[PDB]
RNA sequence: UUCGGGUCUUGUAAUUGGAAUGAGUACAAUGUAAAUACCUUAACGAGGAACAACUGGAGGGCAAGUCUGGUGCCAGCAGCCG
RNA sequence: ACCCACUCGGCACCUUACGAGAAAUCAAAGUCUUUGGGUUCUGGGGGGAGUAUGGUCGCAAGGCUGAAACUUAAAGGAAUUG
């Protein structure tokens, strides 16, 4: 009738067929190969600290004309270097060069979000304090 | 290493959180019975869902089956003892027909309101919360005290409360002291 | 005939050396700065420019490598710049 | 309001004369309904709800000529539904013609019992299904008071039907509202298309209402 | 001219927006009182029955 | 481009890489 | 008869009154190996009851603004479309 | 050797939907939400890419097996009006 066998003693080929087909997915292949630990900037890590190397801005795509204020950060856990996004309006000046910054995911499963090219990480905390608390003047940078 | 005691969730937020008709119905039920949050309606709906799950599971089982008899009449007697299920319909098929408003109605809030000793639903809520109503010479500071049929006749203001007969309270005592002094 | 706009608090003039693709340009800013110039808003496909064109460009204080070109002068306001002489006069750019 | 309704159909003439009393006589003999006023006469309380208004465009040499497709569902919440889908220039006219078609296309449904029968039927009789476009809707009976487990459009259709408890399962591009509602309509009208053991005995084939009352038709 | 300042400067609109102070208010009741207020405002004090409920209707 | 000519260009790149490897094998 | 008493009720007003109560303090006593803490309870403890509830959002998905001012493809927003 | 009738097997064909499909259409692409006759192989968005690497076959050409990093909100199918 259908491609799969149906006999009462065909459990083996059904199981191995499903097991061979499961590699067609992306989530299953990533989970079993464990590419997150080996290749991604973080190994299965929601957040990671890093050191700001320099202070760059990156232009947007065609339909959106602007320059999103980014920052190049070298991760401390392993030494990789990644660009990250300083989210809000007047937060670029808040983060100074060569200060510890806690990058987080960008919410799109490790893929570039919106019109910002070649970035995959937000910025949540700088120098131990959070950017959202600075942006509403609830706390101030310790300046150490 | 000590044996844990099992905490368990008692509510379940709906999957579509943003339904206009459902939101309006929830606000209707909150305003009708003075519910503080909409977690109250979720809790009653969760209790009702557990009850319905048990009822449907027992219904699936064959008629005149020891499991069906035993736990079906156990649930029936528990619900009629609570009072939500009227004595007319102790059949386990009207159990599936109960609505969330039915359990809402048996709250100590609404019962104090019905008895009339509290003239408003929010008045009932505050009167319960101020340690005034006692269900059998035992105060209940909890609005969601499910009042059972056998004990509804014993709701009244407590003796320790000024309403049941005692010293008036802070404001009245202070005013009386001020009047006596001046 | 329109009034020519001067620089102010960060913006500076420059000359296009060679125009790259994808809206990119190499511009010599008159501080000895062979900088990269990005074609910008109000400038995408509304006014056209070419090689060896006088240009005005805003800097970025957080990155001095790249800088964003804002306004272009039409080879006659360039002459006015040249007489008033805010830009270095050791360069000949004629037709 | 102002309504004369000169009947142009023999069925309409019989209805206006008051000779057909219940819509069950219309449904039983598979009579063709072409006057919406017949359905208005037989079911005075047919509520409606505009499910969707959709702008549909045709590309001509000058601009894009745009009309509106209205998806109207009519019913009385007592086992009668109709699904009109119309396209028109003005949205109000689209909705009017959509309700008009919906009233023309009223259909009866066979509500049944999930388990034992205690009161009036609360759910469908059997599992049913329909398919329009690529959207296949599967209606499955549910125990009493289980609500209508369905997407909002299908839920509103069942509420207009009078079905109080039912499970649903939809497969395909159920995005498109017209296809989903048409599939659900096919299923709920198929509910009276399933032979069931309680429906086996043969009947006497009562003569058609336009045979016994042919005289009151044929306006002379 | 074409641009009033350095174009790519960060925190520009934030810097130059007029700081308008918060308007002082009476306390807004919270908890069960807020739900009672909402219930009264929507289902016993029906304001604009025409059209939709139109909560927060713009004044025009 | 056609898949045919992309394939042919890939084959020519393999030509160059194969001769390079053979010279250094 | 225009009314209109509001005849019957339900909200809105920095008007205005009397109540009730904890969150806190605290004689005690209970609690505990001893103490906290809880349960009870003296004496205090609410008027802007300042004893002041936040976190996100208001184009769509998705409940809620085509109100006011600011910036004008900047700044920025946006999980996606924008 | 034709003619008439019938039958088996084959490449096929016309009409039709009363069935199926997103449709173009299919007498199988039917007997599939009323889902199970037996069985083999293949696919899980597009690109990177049938590329690199590792095997293996070949004198060579190249064949078989065959990813990821990364990037992207589409790519694509049928049909309708211009
Ligand atoms: Mg560009
Ligand atoms: Mg807020
Ligand atoms: Mg916002
Ligand atoms: Mg806003
Ligand atoms: Mg909305
Ligand atoms: Mg793929
Ligand atoms: Mg390919
Ligand atoms: Mg090889
Ligand atoms: Mg095509």
mmCIF file with all atom_site columns, C-alpha atoms in Angstrom, chain A residues 19-118:
data_model
loop_
_atom_site.group_PDB
_atom_site.id
_atom_site.type_symbol
_atom_site.label_atom_id
_atom_site.label_alt_id
_atom_site.label_comp_id
_atom_site.label_asym_id
_atom_site.label_entity_id
_atom_site.label_seq_id
_atom_site.pdbx_PDB_ins_code
_atom_site.Cartn_x
_atom_site.Cartn_y
_atom_site.Cartn_z
_atom_site.occupancy
_atom_site.B_iso_or_equiv
_atom_site.pdbx_formal_charge
_atom_site.auth_seq_id
_atom_site.auth_comp_id
_atom_site.auth_asym_id
_atom_site.auth_atom_id
_atom_site.pdbx_PDB_model_num
ATOM 1   C CA . UNK A 1 19  ? 16.479 6.634  12.653 1.00 0.00 ? 19  UNK A CA 1
ATOM 2   C CA . UNK A 1 20  ? 18.019 7.301  9.233  1.00 0.00 ? 20  UNK A CA 1
ATOM 3   C CA . UNK A 1 21  ? 15.320 9.824  8.313  1.00 0.00 ? 21  UNK A CA 1
ATOM 4   C CA . UNK A 1 22  ? 15.665 11.785 11.567 1.00 0.00 ? 22  UNK A CA 1
ATOM 5   C CA . UNK A 1 23  ? 18.933 13.242 10.262 1.00 0.00 ? 23  UNK A CA 1
ATOM 6   C CA . UNK A 1 24  ? 16.923 15.209 7.695  1.00 0.00 ? 24  UNK A CA 1
ATOM 7   C CA . UNK A 1 25  ? 15.769 17.592 10.423 1.00 0.00 ? 25  UNK A CA 1
ATOM 8   C CA . UNK A 1 26  ? 17.998 20.457 11.517 1.00 0.00 ? 26  UNK A CA 1
ATOM 9   C CA . UNK A 1 27  ? 17.189 20.436 15.239 1.00 0.00 ? 27  UNK A CA 1
ATOM 10  C CA . UNK A 1 28  ? 17.830 16.699 15.590 1.00 0.00 ? 28  UNK A CA 1
ATOM 11  C CA . UNK A 1 29  ? 21.046 16.872 13.573 1.00 0.00 ? 29  UNK A CA 1
ATOM 12  C CA . UNK A 1 30  ? 22.311 19.781 15.669 1.00 0.00 ? 30  UNK A CA 1
ATOM 13  C CA . UNK A 1 31  ? 21.367 18.034 18.915 1.00 0.00 ? 31  UNK A CA 1
ATOM 14  C CA . UNK A 1 32  ? 23.022 14.721 18.031 1.00 0.00 ? 32  UNK A CA 1
ATOM 15  C CA . UNK A 1 33  ? 26.110 16.070 16.262 1.00 0.00 ? 33  UNK A CA 1
ATOM 16  C CA . UNK A 1 34  ? 26.453 18.508 19.157 1.00 0.00 ? 34  UNK A CA 1
ATOM 17  C CA . UNK A 1 35  ? 27.540 21.278 16.811 1.00 0.00 ? 35  UNK A CA 1
ATOM 18  C CA . UNK A 1 36  ? 26.526 23.847 19.433 1.00 0.00 ? 36  UNK A CA 1
ATOM 19  C CA . UNK A 1 37  ? 29.410 22.895 21.723 1.00 0.00 ? 37  UNK A CA 1
ATOM 20  C CA . UNK A 1 38  ? 32.054 22.697 19.001 1.00 0.00 ? 38  UNK A CA 1
ATOM 21  C CA . UNK A 1 39  ? 31.223 25.433 16.487 1.00 0.00 ? 39  UNK A CA 1
ATOM 22  C CA . UNK A 1 40  ? 28.848 28.034 17.935 1.00 0.00 ? 40  UNK A CA 1
ATOM 23  C CA . UNK A 1 41  ? 30.379 31.011 19.786 1.00 0.00 ? 41  UNK A CA 1
ATOM 24  C CA . UNK A 1 42  ? 28.781 29.662 22.967 1.00 0.00 ? 42  UNK A CA 1
ATOM 25  C CA . UNK A 1 43  ? 28.510 25.985 23.753 1.00 0.00 ? 43  UNK A CA 1
ATOM 26  C CA . UNK A 1 44  ? 24.843 25.617 24.614 1.00 0.00 ? 44  UNK A CA 1
ATOM 27  C CA . UNK A 1 45  ? 25.059 28.876 26.556 1.00 0.00 ? 45  UNK A CA 1
ATOM 28  C CA . UNK A 1 46  ? 22.283 31.446 26.807 1.00 0.00 ? 46  UNK A CA 1
ATOM 29  C CA . UNK A 1 47  ? 24.665 34.224 27.891 1.00 0.00 ? 47  UNK A CA 1
ATOM 30  C CA . UNK A 1 48  ? 28.397 34.889 27.906 1.00 0.00 ? 48  UNK A CA 1
ATOM 31  C CA . UNK A 1 49  ? 30.690 37.669 29.073 1.00 0.00 ? 49  UNK A CA 1
ATOM 32  C CA . UNK A 1 50  ? 33.343 39.275 26.902 1.00 0.00 ? 50  UNK A CA 1
ATOM 33  C CA . UNK A 1 51  ? 35.723 42.188 26.438 1.00 0.00 ? 51  UNK A CA 1
ATOM 34  C CA . UNK A 1 52  ? 34.947 45.052 24.064 1.00 0.00 ? 52  UNK A CA 1
ATOM 35  C CA . UNK A 1 53  ? 37.704 45.311 21.454 1.00 0.00 ? 53  UNK A CA 1
ATOM 36  C CA . UNK A 1 54  ? 36.379 48.226 19.393 1.00 0.00 ? 54  UNK A CA 1
ATOM 37  C CA . UNK A 1 55  ? 33.165 50.149 18.826 1.00 0.00 ? 55  UNK A CA 1
ATOM 38  C CA . UNK A 1 56  ? 31.622 49.732 15.373 1.00 0.00 ? 56  UNK A CA 1
ATOM 39  C CA . UNK A 1 57  ? 28.389 50.617 13.615 1.00 0.00 ? 57  UNK A CA 1
ATOM 40  C CA . UNK A 1 58  ? 26.930 48.481 10.835 1.00 0.00 ? 58  UNK A CA 1
ATOM 41  C CA . UNK A 1 59  ? 24.661 49.637 8.014  1.00 0.00 ? 59  UNK A CA 1
ATOM 42  C CA . UNK A 1 60  ? 21.285 48.007 7.464  1.00 0.00 ? 60  UNK A CA 1
ATOM 43  C CA . UNK A 1 61  ? 19.821 46.236 4.415  1.00 0.00 ? 61  UNK A CA 1
ATOM 44  C CA . UNK A 1 62  ? 18.044 47.755 1.388  1.00 0.00 ? 62  UNK A CA 1
ATOM 45  C CA . UNK A 1 63  ? 14.501 48.386 2.697  1.00 0.00 ? 63  UNK A CA 1
ATOM 46  C CA . UNK A 1 64  ? 15.864 49.900 5.922  1.00 0.00 ? 64  UNK A CA 1
ATOM 47  C CA . UNK A 1 65  ? 18.335 52.793 5.793  1.00 0.00 ? 65  UNK A CA 1
ATOM 48  C CA . UNK A 1 66  ? 20.221 53.435 9.043  1.00 0.00 ? 66  UNK A CA 1
ATOM 49  C CA . UNK A 1 67  ? 23.377 52.439 10.907 1.00 0.00 ? 67  UNK A CA 1
ATOM 50  C CA . UNK A 1 68  ? 22.802 50.123 13.862 1.00 0.00 ? 68  UNK A CA 1
ATOM 51  C CA . UNK A 1 69  ? 25.319 50.718 16.649 1.00 0.00 ? 69  UNK A CA 1
ATOM 52  C CA . UNK A 1 70  ? 27.168 47.452 17.261 1.00 0.00 ? 70  UNK A CA 1
ATOM 53  C CA . UNK A 1 71  ? 30.261 46.466 19.246 1.00 0.00 ? 71  UNK A CA 1
ATOM 54  C CA . UNK A 1 72  ? 32.962 43.873 18.568 1.00 0.00 ? 72  UNK A CA 1
ATOM 55  C CA . UNK A 1 73  ? 33.496 41.686 21.646 1.00 0.00 ? 73  UNK A CA 1
ATOM 56  C CA . UNK A 1 74  ? 36.060 38.947 22.218 1.00 0.00 ? 74  UNK A CA 1
ATOM 57  C CA . UNK A 1 75  ? 34.525 36.235 24.380 1.00 0.00 ? 75  UNK A CA 1
ATOM 58  C CA . UNK A 1 76  ? 36.362 35.420 27.592 1.00 0.00 ? 76  UNK A CA 1
ATOM 59  C CA . UNK A 1 77  ? 35.203 31.805 27.986 1.00 0.00 ? 77  UNK A CA 1
ATOM 60  C CA . UNK A 1 78  ? 37.027 30.583 24.858 1.00 0.00 ? 78  UNK A CA 1
ATOM 61  C CA . UNK A 1 79  ? 38.515 33.584 23.022 1.00 0.00 ? 79  UNK A CA 1
ATOM 62  C CA . UNK A 1 80  ? 36.203 33.815 20.013 1.00 0.00 ? 80  UNK A CA 1
ATOM 63  C CA . UNK A 1 81  ? 35.350 37.244 18.602 1.00 0.00 ? 81  UNK A CA 1
ATOM 64  C CA . UNK A 1 82  ? 31.783 38.193 17.675 1.00 0.00 ? 82  UNK A CA 1
ATOM 65  C CA . UNK A 1 83  ? 29.883 41.345 16.855 1.00 0.00 ? 83  UNK A CA 1
ATOM 66  C CA . UNK A 1 84  ? 27.011 42.211 19.175 1.00 0.00 ? 84  UNK A CA 1
ATOM 67  C CA . UNK A 1 85  ? 24.217 44.761 19.238 1.00 0.00 ? 85  UNK A CA 1
ATOM 68  C CA . UNK A 1 86  ? 23.760 47.614 21.692 1.00 0.00 ? 86  UNK A CA 1
ATOM 69  C CA . UNK A 1 87  ? 19.962 47.674 21.731 1.00 0.00 ? 87  UNK A CA 1
ATOM 70  C CA . UNK A 1 88  ? 18.464 50.997 22.747 1.00 0.00 ? 88  UNK A CA 1
ATOM 71  C CA . UNK A 1 89  ? 18.740 54.593 21.598 1.00 0.00 ? 89  UNK A CA 1
ATOM 72  C CA . UNK A 1 90  ? 21.385 56.254 23.739 1.00 0.00 ? 90  UNK A CA 1
ATOM 73  C CA . UNK A 1 91  ? 23.184 53.148 24.967 1.00 0.00 ? 91  UNK A CA 1
ATOM 74  C CA . UNK A 1 92  ? 26.168 53.235 22.598 1.00 0.00 ? 92  UNK A CA 1
ATOM 75  C CA . UNK A 1 93  ? 27.903 55.854 24.744 1.00 0.00 ? 93  UNK A CA 1
ATOM 76  C CA . UNK A 1 94  ? 27.038 53.918 27.907 1.00 0.00 ? 94  UNK A CA 1
ATOM 77  C CA . UNK A 1 95  ? 29.351 51.031 26.991 1.00 0.00 ? 95  UNK A CA 1
ATOM 78  C CA . UNK A 1 96  ? 32.964 52.172 26.822 1.00 0.00 ? 96  UNK A CA 1
ATOM 79  C CA . UNK A 1 97  ? 35.840 50.411 25.101 1.00 0.00 ? 97  UNK A CA 1
ATOM 80  C CA . UNK A 1 98  ? 37.584 47.516 26.880 1.00 0.00 ? 98  UNK A CA 1
ATOM 81  C CA . UNK A 1 99  ? 34.934 46.876 29.540 1.00 0.00 ? 99  UNK A CA 1
ATOM 82  C CA . UNK A 1 100 ? 33.305 43.572 30.417 1.00 0.00 ? 100 UNK A CA 1
ATOM 83  C CA . UNK A 1 101 ? 29.957 43.141 28.661 1.00 0.00 ? 101 UNK A CA 1
ATOM 84  C CA . UNK A 1 102 ? 27.505 40.249 29.037 1.00 0.00 ? 102 UNK A CA 1
ATOM 85  C CA . UNK A 1 103 ? 26.146 39.305 25.618 1.00 0.00 ? 103 UNK A CA 1
ATOM 86  C CA . UNK A 1 104 ? 22.924 37.333 25.251 1.00 0.00 ? 104 UNK A CA 1
ATOM 87  C CA . UNK A 1 105 ? 21.148 35.640 22.387 1.00 0.00 ? 105 UNK A CA 1
ATOM 88  C CA . UNK A 1 106 ? 19.438 37.768 19.768 1.00 0.00 ? 106 UNK A CA 1
ATOM 89  C CA . UNK A 1 107 ? 16.187 35.796 19.952 1.00 0.00 ? 107 UNK A CA 1
ATOM 90  C CA . UNK A 1 108 ? 16.263 34.348 16.429 1.00 0.00 ? 108 UNK A CA 1
ATOM 91  C CA . UNK A 1 109 ? 17.922 31.009 17.262 1.00 0.00 ? 109 UNK A CA 1
ATOM 92  C CA . UNK A 1 110 ? 21.456 32.200 16.554 1.00 0.00 ? 110 UNK A CA 1
ATOM 93  C CA . UNK A 1 111 ? 20.565 33.936 13.282 1.00 0.00 ? 111 UNK A CA 1
ATOM 94  C CA . UNK A 1 112 ? 20.691 37.574 12.224 1.00 0.00 ? 112 UNK A CA 1
ATOM 95  C CA . UNK A 1 113 ? 17.549 39.467 13.220 1.00 0.00 ? 113 UNK A CA 1
ATOM 96  C CA . UNK A 1 114 ? 15.756 42.102 11.195 1.00 0.00 ? 114 UNK A CA 1
ATOM 97  C CA . UNK A 1 115 ? 17.874 44.353 9.001  1.00 0.00 ? 115 UNK A CA 1
ATOM 98  C CA . UNK A 1 116 ? 21.179 44.077 10.902 1.00 0.00 ? 116 UNK A CA 1
ATOM 99  C CA . UNK A 1 117 ? 23.630 41.904 8.914  1.00 0.00 ? 117 UNK A CA 1
ATOM 100 C CA . UNK A 1 118 ? 26.218 39.619 10.455 1.00 0.00 ? 118 UNK A CA 1
#
